[PDB]
Amino acid sequence: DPDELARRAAQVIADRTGIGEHDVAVVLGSGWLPAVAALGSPTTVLPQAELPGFVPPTAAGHAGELLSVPIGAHRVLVLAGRIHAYEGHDLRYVVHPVRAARAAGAQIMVLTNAAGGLRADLQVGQPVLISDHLNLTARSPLVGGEFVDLTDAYSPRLRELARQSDPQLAEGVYAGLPGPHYETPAEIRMLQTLGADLVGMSTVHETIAARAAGAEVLGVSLVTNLAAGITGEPLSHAEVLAAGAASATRMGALLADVIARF
Amino acid sequence: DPDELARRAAQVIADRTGIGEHDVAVVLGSGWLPAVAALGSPTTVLPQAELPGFVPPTAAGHAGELLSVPIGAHRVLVLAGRIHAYEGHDLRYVVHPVRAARAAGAQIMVLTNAAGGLRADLQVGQPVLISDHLNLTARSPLVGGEFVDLTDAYSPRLRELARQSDPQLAEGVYAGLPGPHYETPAEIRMLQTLGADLVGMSTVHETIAARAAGAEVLGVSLVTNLAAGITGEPLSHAEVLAAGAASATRMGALLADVIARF
Amino acid sequence: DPDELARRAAQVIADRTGIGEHDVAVVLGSGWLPAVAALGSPTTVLPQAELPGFVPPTAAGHAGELLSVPIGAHRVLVLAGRIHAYEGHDLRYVVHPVRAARAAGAQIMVLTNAAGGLRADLQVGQPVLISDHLNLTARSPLVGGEFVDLTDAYSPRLRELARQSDPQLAEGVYAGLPGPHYETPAEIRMLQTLGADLVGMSTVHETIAARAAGAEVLGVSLVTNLAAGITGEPLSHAEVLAAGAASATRMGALLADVIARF
Numbered sequence A, B, C: 001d002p003d004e005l006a007r008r009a010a011q012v013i014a015d016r017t018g019i020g021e022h023d024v025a026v027v028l029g030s031g032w033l034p035a036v037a038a039l040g041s042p043t044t045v046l047p048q049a050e051l052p053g054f055v056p057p058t059a060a061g062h063a064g065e066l067l068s069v070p071i072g073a074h075r076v077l078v079l080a081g082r083i084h085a086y087e088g089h090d091l092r093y094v095v096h097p098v099r100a101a102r103a104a105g106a107q108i109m110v111l112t113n114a115a116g117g118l119r120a121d122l123q124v125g126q127p128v129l130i131s132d133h134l135n136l137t138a139r140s141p142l143v144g145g146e147f148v149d150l151t152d153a154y155s156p157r158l159r160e161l162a163r164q165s166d167p168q169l170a171e172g173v174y175a176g177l178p179g180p181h182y183e184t185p186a187e188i189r190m191l192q193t194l195g196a197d198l199v200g201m202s203t204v205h206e207t208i209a210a211r212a213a214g215a216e217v218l219g220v221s222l223v224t225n226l227a228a229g230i231t232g233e234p235l236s237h238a239e240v241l242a243a244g245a246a247s248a249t250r251m252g253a254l255l256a257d258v259i260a261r262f
């Protein structure tokens, strides 16, 4: 049972951090690892692996740590690193971190990720607020008759607050695919036709799980590379991490400021 | 063995109803539960759970009953409620009811469902004949080299008969998704681009199985809500059932008049 | 570990053929079985089933044999027949033949298949070079952080060589679907919108695996039928095999000549 597992994880989080309840949770994706320090001074740092139900992250660029950080008037859970469906894990494990965070009191989830940019106006290193998503995985983290509405899955209010921190922030539709292979140029052209502005291999299930659990979501993609076929240059995860590092300072500052506005 | 399991179920149906063979089968979807009265008076009513191979439905609004009803010159098998892929069962179980009906003698399957309306003309409460479908589940109920043709999956002949009952019935293409989460507005815009007029989380596999088993199919979607993002109002299953209830008498009467024409 | 299984198979292949290493591998798809003769005189012919990791092909038209044939200056592994995801096997098995071929020394994979034609200028019996693909299976043969780039998945260089053999060769985008049911006309219209020129139920995963393993790929689809809904006539696998047979002489001559140019 996902709920009981989440509660057990939340209890351990409370016991180890000494904080009975957190207010916000942030998941740092590929390329975002170095932005963790700017969020603030952690009062607790521990391995995600220690927590019940947490499959340790294994992808390059994911620290696999959980930090408790005070940001503004909030106590924030920072999930440095995440796991993905392409790693072979049942979605119950993929969305467990968000569910555990919710069980720990977090009613706002800030989901960040590295994405390929499909819209012509997007440049490498640019942060893009996720306005909506396209779940192209043919899967759902929900089982049974859990008919969750996804109309304002990415809270307009939170995107407005982000815009208050930095007015220049653009928005875009994120397409979530299975992965782990990158897309072919033809698939990218297809995604453009489908209305996608960004492409990645995560986030969508976590967003669905968050909404199902009653939490709001702010999604932020860092354009770590132009989508396959745009430049013709081959994609590389190492380069994705490098591109993310170049914007780490701005990203950390952005997250710290926006969260404090919540 | 799917076929043998279907034969066993068909035998129990014959013994329990006292009817050696049925001619038509109707699967009542979400919101269609109370349409049974308008179909006619059952001569036998029994729990699906008591039939070999039948996984009991669990979604709200699905009774999980089987009724034998005389409609016109036909002996009709009415499956009040269905199971869906989002409930986690292998497709063999999802399409078993249709295969059991075929084994019971039904050469015509009337598959009804609750669907979100995407096309501009559609209104809540409007019945729509399924002209074709878009299987967007990345799955198939068929295994191995069962290369079944789906050119006229939804019999033009049956749609013609349906229009004799109600000349104003409109047609539309049904998009079948995994579920159980409702679609995001972006996904709905994507489906419109793909050619979808209706969207649901069932039916496609049942239609495929019916075709593979030599049965004709008449699909009827009841627009229980406008697709996500159309009205901007959040979708709700309880509201889907309420919408269905408001049109149940009309739907039952429609089904009765159409089936009598078979 | 797929790589270890691949090496083991490669060792058995070397022992059984008396050839320490092969240079090119060709997978003959549906309808291509009779094209074998034109490739040359095999020095060894053995059942795929007798090789480690090879799940025996079962689809009609797939011989399930492995032949070592000298073509031009190359020692070629000819895989007469393949397995498909619709047969229910884990993708590790679906791409094993290609990985085994790579482990045996093949740095070039010629993947042939039978496909439905969507583009108006394509005719039944026409061979079409695959310029790119659309993986619409919601799956990948890769696991974990295998972030493989698919920018030039179908080697432009190899397509140029094929063109030297037959200058009139057309190119097109191949859409890979789960199968085994054929597409509905509405689905075909959708595929056209997505940019597909050809449609089939194989190849994409093999191409991805080949790329991840460092081999170039030349994809050749034989239009064995026009896509569902184009003619209005139902599709049939037996007819697909018949269409393939009608072009077998041309296909075999094409393959023999192109491979000699590698």
Ligand SMILES: O=c1[nH]cnc2c([C@@H]3N[C@H](CO)[C@@H](O)[C@H]3O)c[nH]c12
Residues within 6 Å of the ligand: A030, A059, A084, A114, A115, A116, A117, A179, A182, A183, A199, A200, A201, A202, A224, A225, A226, A227, A228, A235, A236, A237, A240, C147
């Ligand atoms: O262009 C892209 N396509 C698909 N995924 C990604 C990503 C994300 N980064 C990781 C691969 O580098 C993977 O976890 C994926 O979700 C960055 N750029 C792209």
Ligand SMILES: O=c1[nH]cnc2c([C@@H]3N[C@H](CO)[C@@H](O)[C@H]3O)c[nH]c12
Residues within 6 Å of the ligand: A147, B030, B059, B084, B114, B115, B116, B117, B179, B182, B183, B199, B200, B201, B202, B224, B225, B226, B227, B228, B235, B236, B237, B240
């Ligand atoms: O807008 C919609 N999108 C997807 N499914 C449905 C449905 C059908 N009704 C059920 C959810 O209420 C579910 O089984 C689904 O198949 C009604 N409206 C919609």
Ligand SMILES: O=c1[nH]cnc2c([C@@H]3N[C@H](CO)[C@@H](O)[C@H]3O)c[nH]c12
Residues within 6 Å of the ligand: B147, C030, C059, C084, C114, C115, C116, C117, C179, C182, C183, C199, C200, C201, C202, C224, C225, C226, C227, C228, C235, C236, C237, C240
């Ligand atoms: O029109 C078509 N649609 C989908 N697959 C195929 C095929 C290929 N041939 C086989 C079915 O005949 C199957 O393995 C599929 O990959 C030929 N024509 C079509």
